[PDB]
Structure 1
Amino acid sequence: KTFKQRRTFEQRVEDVRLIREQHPTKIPVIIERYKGEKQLPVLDKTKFLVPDHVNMSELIKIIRRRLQLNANQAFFLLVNGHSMVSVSTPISEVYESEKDEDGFLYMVYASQETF
């Protein structure tokens, strides 16, 4: 069901290695709906190539646009299982401290802060 369930550790590591070779300026991001979520739609895909200069605040605006949300739908984004301490950090920094051992950056979204 979830990305980590669908692909082996060996498979995830090799995909990250091919993104490094072919999209060297991009952060490989896995974005998933909270298994509890009722209100927000599911995304059209799971694996995202995010330009490494964008900060978390802009990435939240990107995903809100992808979901086609309006001004007063709530949207919370967990990185590596937890709240972002700051939305102003460049995703290249966030990656180095929050990356998985397979080399993806894992994010989860919901309409409640309580996931």
Structure 2
Amino acid sequence: KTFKQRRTFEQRVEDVRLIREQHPTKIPVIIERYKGEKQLPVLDKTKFLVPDHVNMSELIKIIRRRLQLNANQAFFLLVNGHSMVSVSTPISEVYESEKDEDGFLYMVYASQETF
């Protein structure tokens, strides 16, 4: 079901190495619905190439636009399994501290803060 489950550590590593060589200015992001989630829809895809200059506040806005949410639907975004300390951090900086050993940046969303 989940991305890590579908692809071998070997395959996730190689894909990240390709994105480096074909989309060098992009952060390779895995974005996934919380397995519990009842309310929000599933995304049309899993793997996103995010411009390395957008901050986390703008990435939340992008995903809310991609889910076509409305103003008063709740949305929470975990990064590397935990809460974002700050939405104003640039995704280039977030990547350098929160990336996985395979080289993706893993995110999970829900309507509840309690995942």
> What TM-score do the two structures reach when normalised by structure 2?
1.00
1:77 Cα shift? 0.2
**How much does 1:46 deviate?**
0.1
Q: Which runs of no fewer than 5 residues in structure 1 stay unpaired?
A: none
1:28-67 alpha-carbon deviations (Å, 9 max, x no partner): 0000000000000000000000000000000000000000
The RMSD of aligned alpha carbons is: 0.2
Unaligned runs of 5+ in 2: none
**1:13 counterpart residue number:** 13
Alpha-carbon shift at residue 9 of structure 1 (Å):
0.2
Q: Is structure 2 residue 92 aligned with structure 1 residue 92?
A: yes
Aligned to 1:10, the other structure's residue is in SS state: helix
Percentage identity across paired residues of the two chains: 100
Cα drift, residue 94 of structure 1:
0.1
Whole-Å separation in 2 of the counterparts to 1:72 and 1:86:
21
**What CA distance in whole angstroms lies between the structure 2 residues aligned with 1:18 and 1:95?**
17
Moved over 2 A (4+): none
CA displacement at 1:109 relative to structure 2? 0.1
Aligned to 1:110: 110
Q: How does 1:4-43 map to 2 (within 5 A)?
A: 4-43=4-43
Using the size of structure 1 for normalisation, the TM-score is: 1.00
Does the residue aligned with 1:58 lie in a helix, a strand or coil?
helix
Helix, strand or coil at the partner of 2:65: helix
For 1:48 and 1:98, the matched residues in 2 are separated by 16
